[PDB]
Structures are given as structure tokens and as C-alpha cells.
Specification:
Radius of gyration of chain A: 14 Å
Helix content of chain B: 25-40%
Shape of chain B: flat
Organism (chain B): Homo sapiens (Human)
Family (chain B): Belongs to the actin family.
Number of helices of chain B: 15
Strand order of the largest sheet of chain A: 1-3-6-5
Shape of chain A: globular
Catalytic activity (chain B): ATP + H2O = ADP + phosphate + H(+)
Largest interface: A-B, 5 and 2 residues
Subcellular location (chain B): Cytoplasm, Cytoskeleton
Helix content of chain A: under 10%
Distance between the termini of chain A: 41 Å
Oligomer: part of a larger assembly
Largest sheet of chain A: 4 strands, antiparallel
EC number (chain B): 3.6.4.-
Strand content of chain A: over 45%
Number of strands of chain A: 8
Distance between the termini of chain B: 24 Å
């Protein structure tokens, strides 16, 4: 099949209403991998970090797998749409597409 | 024996003639406390001199006695000399002639004043002032070649043929590692880190000495710095602050190669070496290219010899091979040359006697030596 990428676990689609927090995550099997989050082909989520979007990076010692998390808190209707996760590393390449729905 | 002192920019190298390595190596700096100190029981040591200052660098406002090969304040220099004679050396100035090494095309006042202080402030039977390019050549062990000497202060090129010198052929360049440090501090500010004090000024210089290196191709590394992985390293300050640098480290050494970033018309180090060669006689040019010797503090970064070789080979004719010799510890080569120079039997006759000074006058230094 397709070559083994960085993600042991690919991000999964989720839906949350106004004022609701939603967490999206991806894990990478293992120096530390670098993770970028996008709201499309050319939009970077890190530059958009604020009241409704947070970023967090963690490492799991037992599986020596890196966890990348996208934190959305108090999600609003304007956040309904398509979000894209892109991760690039020294030896592996992969990305994924997910959708978030928030209502009024 | 004999005493050899190197009064270069930022560092004072002292030792004994005939020795392969100097006894005393320490920065030539005096640090004083700019800000009032808060604590109980402190000796409040007003003045710090030497390597002690390096440890307590953040609080202290460091001052360099020597700027561009010129000493701004004479008393600080005396403290440095005193420190070298009675601390690590543990010897009296009276005991031996003292050899000082000076860079090419240096101003007249520096040689006359330097000798005057050595004859008057530290009493010695005789002293001699040497030239860095010739001394470096001796360390090399080669009779003929072209010597590019780049110190912490001013880069100089001095070609030599079987012992005969060409003063017209010697070229002085105003690009040096200290200049790079100022450019470097200036470049850091755009990123978001700012250093505006002399004490933290050394911190960027420290970063430059081991972290910085020279790229095979400047444009390609910048291109690949977008996805930097091994291009970024973390530097730990004594203060406790953490610094992360990327493409920034290799573009600094680049400036000597590419003065354009600096904003100056003058050509880079490889072009200047070429210019010195052009000045020299056409017949002796052919072995000048294959006998190139690198020396000084700013030639330490890896890959310099390899970049210079390809650039000299492409610009120069392909009819002859281009060889560059860049031995390690070339920074200390100038001091080493001083110790070896004082070790020759012929040389002892050549020292400037006290009697000659008294009769003829201070201006005889240029007359007696180059």
C-alpha cells in the first residue's frame, strides 16, 4: 500500500458547537519531528493562534511517539470548514484533511 | 631565554622564547561594575582584569585597551603587561629582551610609543618589533610564498620571495572578525534579539567562534534554511538565557567573502589575496598560488580553505595547481613566530639597543627595521 508516514494515528474529523472545546491530534513514530497546521494549501494556523485556537506538542515515552495537538476552545460557527494538517521531517512526508463544524 | 608578548586585539598572548606554546593566554580587558551592587559581604571588587572578567561578564562593562591595532588607554595595557610578567610568566622584564609582534603597514606612532614604553616603563637592555607575516611564514617553514595574515583587528597580506620583500605588493584590508561581530550583533536585532552593551557583545563573538561555519555555497544553504533541522542549535549563556540560531550563523563568516552584505565597495578576502598577487612580480606569481598560507583568528572556521581553493583555482589560470596550507592553531602562529624569531642567533645582534635609542632617537625604528 502507501508508504509508512510520520503518523501512527492520523487526525480524525470532529464537530463542536459555540463555546465548545475540541481537540485534534496526530502521533508520530520516532531528533523531534516538526509539525505545521494549515487552514488550506497556503494558510498557517500557528500565525492564527489566539482566543479560539491553541497549539500543544507532547512526547509519549513508552511508544516513543510524538503527539501533536490542535486545541480549539469556545468554538464558534465561523470556524465551520476544512482544516489541513501537514507534517514534514528529516526522512518522512505526510498530511491529512479534516472538517470541523460549529453552530451559531 | 627571552620574553615574547603579543598585544593583539582582545587577547594578550605571553610566554617564553623557545617554547612551542605561550604560558599566559587571556583576554585584554578591564571590567568595572556599571550598576550599583546589591548584596551583603561583597568585597565590591571595583576592577576585574583577565579571565575573571569573562565569568562575571554580564554585570561588568568590558573595555578593550586596543582598538584597530591602536591602544586607547595606556595604563590598562600596563596592567595587562604587569599581569603577564608577574602572574603566569613569573619573570622580571629586566631578565630578558622583549619581543613584540606588529601587523604590516601599521602607523609610525605605534612603534615609537611602544618602544618608548618598553625602554622607560619596563627597563630592559634591548627590544625588537617584529612583523606578523614573516613570523607566520617561519611557522609554516617555507622560504617562498604569500602570507595572508588576519588578526582580530586588521587583515593584512604580505608576499615573500626567498627572503626578499615587496612593500608595494603588501595590501592592508579593513575586514576582520571583530567587524563581523559588529555586523553580527546588527543582524540579530531584526530577528528579535538585541545586544547593545559591550559585555554581551562578547557573547555573540563566542557564538561565532564555535557555532559559526562557512557554507560551500551561500545561496543553497539559505534556500534549505526554510526546513532547518540540523541548521539550528541552542546556546546556553552564563546568565541562563537560551539562544537559538539558524541560517544566521553561516551568513556572518560569509561577509568576509561577500562584503556586499556589509555595504562596502572593498572586495572580499579571496579577491584581496588575488590583488596582492597582481601587485607582485609576474615571475614569482606562479609559486605564490600554490604556496598560500592562512593565519589568524578569523581563519579558524572549517571549509575556508576548501572555499578559497575552488575560488582561487577558478579565477586563476588552470595551468598550475592551487594549494592552500591552513594548519591548526594558526591564530597563535603570530605569537609562535615571535618565540621562534627570538630563538635565532642572527636575530640577537638585530635587537634595538638602549644606547642607539639614546643617541639617534625614537624615529630610528623604521630606519633599522621594516
Amino acid at each position: 500500500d502507501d508508504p509508512i508516514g510520520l503518523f501512527v494515528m492520523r487526525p480524525q474529523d470532529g464537530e463542536v458547537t459555540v463555546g465548545g472545546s475540541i481537540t485534534f491530534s496526530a502521533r508520530v513514530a520516532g531528533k523531534p519531528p516538526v509539525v505545521k497546521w494549515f487552514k488550506g494549501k497556503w494558510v498557517d494556523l500557528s500565525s492564527k493562534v489566539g482566543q479560539h485556537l491553541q497549539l500543544h506538542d507532547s512526547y509519549d515515552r513508552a511508544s516513543k511517539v510524538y503527539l501533536f495537538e490542535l486545541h480549539i476552545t469556545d468554538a464558534q460557527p465561523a470556524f465551520t470548514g476544512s482544516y489541513r494538517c501537514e507534517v514534514s521531517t528529516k526522512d518522512k512526508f505526510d498530511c491529512s484533511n479534516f472538517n470541523l463544524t460549529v453552530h451559531e | 631565554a627571552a620574553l615574547v608578548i603579543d598585544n593583539g586585539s582582545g587577547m594578550c598572548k605571553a610566554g617564553f622564547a623557545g617554547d612551542d606554546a605561550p604560558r599566559a593566554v587571556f583576554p585584554s580587558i578591564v571590567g568595572r561594575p556599571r550598576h550599583q551592587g546589591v548584596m551583603v559581604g561583597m568585597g565590591q571588587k571595583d576592577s576585574y582584569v583577565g579571565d575573571e572578567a569573562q565569568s562575571k561578564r554580564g554585570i561588568l562593562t568590558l573595555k578593550y585597551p586596543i582598538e584597530h591595532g591602536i591602544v586607547t588607554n595606556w595604563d590598562d595595557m600596563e596592567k595587562i603587561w604587569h599581569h603577564t610578567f608577574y602572574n603566569e610568566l613569573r619573570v622580571a622584564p629586566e631578565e630578558h629582551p622583549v619581543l613584540l609582534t606588529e601587523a604590516p603597514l601599521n602607523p609610525k606612532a605605534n612603534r615609537e610609543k611602544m618602544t618608548q614604553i618598553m625602554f622607560e616603563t619596563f627597563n630592559t637592555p634591548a627590544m625588537y618589533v617584529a612583523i606578523q607575516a614573516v613570523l607566520s611564514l617561519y611557522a609554516s617553514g617555507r622560504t617562498t610564498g604569500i602570507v595572508m595574515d588576519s588578526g582580530d583587528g586588521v587583515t593584512h597580506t604580505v608576499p615573500i620571495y626567498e627572503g626578499y620583500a615587496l612593500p608595494h605588493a603588501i595590501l592592508r584590508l579593513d575586514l576582520a572578525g571583530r567587524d563581523l561581530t559588529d555586523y553580527l550583533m546588527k543582524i540579530l536585532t531584526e530577528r528579535g534579539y538585541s545586544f547593545t552593551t559591550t559585555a554581551e557583545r562578547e557573547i555573540v563573538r563566542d557564538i561565532k567562534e564555535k557555532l559559526c561555519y562557512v557554507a560551500l555555497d551561500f545561496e543553497q544553504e539559505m534556500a534549505t534554511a526554510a526546513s532547518s533541522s540540523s541548521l539550528e542549535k541552542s546556546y546556553e549563556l552564563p546568565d541562563g538565557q537560551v539562544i537559538t540560531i539558524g541560517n544566521e550563523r553561516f551568513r556572518c563568516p560569509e561577509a568576509l567573502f561577500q562584503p556586499s552584505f556589509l555595504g562596502m565597495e572593498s572586495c572580499g578576502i579571496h579577491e584581496t589575496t588575488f590583488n596582492s598577487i597582481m601587485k607582485c612580480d609576474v615571475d614569482i606569481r606562479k609559486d605564490l598560488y600554490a604556496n598560500t598560507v592562512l593565519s589568524g583568528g578569523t581563519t579558524m572556521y572549517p571549509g575556508i580553505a576548501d572555499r578559497m581553493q575552488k575560488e582561487i583555482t577558478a579565477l586563476a589560470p588552470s595551468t598550475m595547481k592551487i594549494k592552500i596550507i591552513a594548519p591548526p592553531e594558526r591564530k597563535y602562529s603570530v605569537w609562535i613566530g615571535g618565540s621562534i624569531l627570538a630563538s635565532l642567533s642572527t636575530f640577537q645582534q638585530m635587537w634595538i639597543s638602549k644606547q642607539e635609542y639614546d643617541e639617534s632617537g625614537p624615529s630610528i625604528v623604521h630606519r633599522k627595521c621594516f
